[PDB]
Design a protein around this ligand. Structure first.
Ligand SMILES: NC(=O)c1ccc[n+]([C@@H]2O[C@H](COP(=O)([O-])OP(=O)(O)OC[C@H]3O[C@@H](n4cnc5c(N)ncnc54)[C@H](OP(=O)(O)O)[C@@H]3O)[C@@H](O)[C@H]2O)c1
Ligand SMILES: O=C(O)Cc1nn(Cc2nc3cc(C(F)(F)F)ccc3s2)c(=O)c2ccccc12
Length: 315
């Protein structure tokens, strides 16, 4: 099955195209190719600095009548410098304008941490610590609920929230809409059993990011583990006559997760979509689960003293 039912009553394609690090001169053609070969979900963010160009592709394929808007599922995220209640509508409308859309299917709080508002995405003090904003997750959430009530977004969610932060929203005084999705890092080196079961127990759909371990992350180091080159995963791929990436994409799919691998390579964009015609065994699943090492691609040191930093917590 190609889509999962969200708690807002809408259906979300379980495979999406990621766009973090997709160069602006290549992401328009990447998104056009993806839509041509089947993708119907694009994961976006203002902080990726490429929403305009993603938007050009979406709008051309709509104008070409390759797809109807209702068949697309477009996701973006509120960046950390816009957590203030007074900045949230603007930030969403900048994304909508850039994407050439009149609504988003899902809008996420990108990170639980608010940063000082300004031009800078990562405002730092002279010692390199991120500068927080005094905003809290619950007031930001109410601001997200208003976007639903204005028709600018069909669903709201969170990203990089730990289980205590998820629980804080769920127990928020006067909560009007539950989060639909929690988008978190997840792959065989960061399997997240604990956080995923909590979220699913609550009817919150989990989207797995960096499912290939983000080989193009700009801070990669030689000693870091490498999913795509792990002989153990390679062997599972060979047994199935599939690529390693294809195993790494199908793995979250069978955990009832949405997965959003990124590429700007047309061959890989296509390859990455060809994951609905095979199955990993239970044993494969448990074997891949066993590779966990609590290894994170995304956990920037300069943010670790923020009050709301999500990754000190066990969950
Ligand atoms: N919510 C958040 O905080 C958050 C954080 C991180 C990521 N995300 C989202 O999740 C998406 C996916 O994560 P990611 O970008 O970190 O990394 P990823 O999808 O794990 O890996 C992307 C890398 O894999 C390469 N690649 C793609 N398909 C391949 C294939 N079939 N074979 C071999 N290599 C392949 C890509 O190369 P080419 O592009 O050169 O083909 C790129 O270098 C992001 O782009 C973003 O949309 C969200
Ligand atoms: O953001 C993306 O989608 C990809 C992403 N990840 N990271 C690593 C990060 N680690 C964080 C940790 C916190 C924290 F909440 F933990 F404080 C807050 C914010 C961040 S950004 C980046 O530094 C980044 C920079 C530009 C564009 C995208 C990203």
């Amino acid at each position: 099955a190609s889509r999962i039912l969200l708690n807002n009553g809408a259906k979300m394609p379980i495979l999406g195209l990621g766009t973090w690090k997709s160069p602006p001169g290549q992401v328009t053609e990447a998104v056009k190719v993806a839509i041509d070969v089947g993708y119907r979900h694009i994961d976006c963010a203002h902080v990726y600095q490429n929403e305009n160009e993603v938007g050009v592709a979406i709008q051309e394929k709509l104008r070409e009548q390759v797809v109807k808007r209702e068949e697309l599922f477009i996701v973006s995220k509120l960046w950390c410098t816009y957590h203030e209640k007074g900045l949230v509508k603007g930030a969403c409308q900048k994304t909508l304008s850039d994407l050439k859309l009149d609504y988003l299917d899902l809008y996420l709080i990108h990170w639980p941490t608010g940063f000082k508002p300004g031009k800078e995405f990562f405002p730092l003090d002279e010692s390199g610590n991120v500068v927080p904003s005094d905003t809290n997750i619950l007031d930001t959430w109410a601001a997200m609920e208003e976007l639903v009530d204005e028709g600018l977004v069909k669903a709201i969610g969170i990203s990089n929230f730990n289980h205590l932060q998820v629980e804080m929203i769920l127990n928020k005084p006067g909560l009007k809409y539950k989060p639909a999705v929690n988008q978190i890092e997840c792959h065989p080196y960061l399997t997240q059993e604990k956080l995923i079961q909590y979220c699913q127990s609550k009817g919150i759909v989990v989207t797995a990011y960096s499912p290939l371990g983000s080989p193009d992350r700009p801070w990669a180091k030689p000693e870091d583990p490498s999913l795509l080159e792990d002989p153990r995963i390679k062997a599972i791929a060979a047994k199935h006559n599939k690529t390693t990436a294809q195993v790494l994409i199908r793995f979250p799919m069978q955990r009832n997760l949405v997965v959003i691998p990124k590429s700007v390579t047309p061959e890989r964009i296509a390859e990455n979509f060809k994951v609905f015609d095979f199955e990993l065994s239970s044993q494969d699943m448990t074997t891949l689960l066993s590779y966990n090492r609590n290894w994170r691609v995304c956990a920037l040191l300069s943010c670790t003293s923020h009050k709301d930093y999500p990754f000190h917590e066990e969950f």
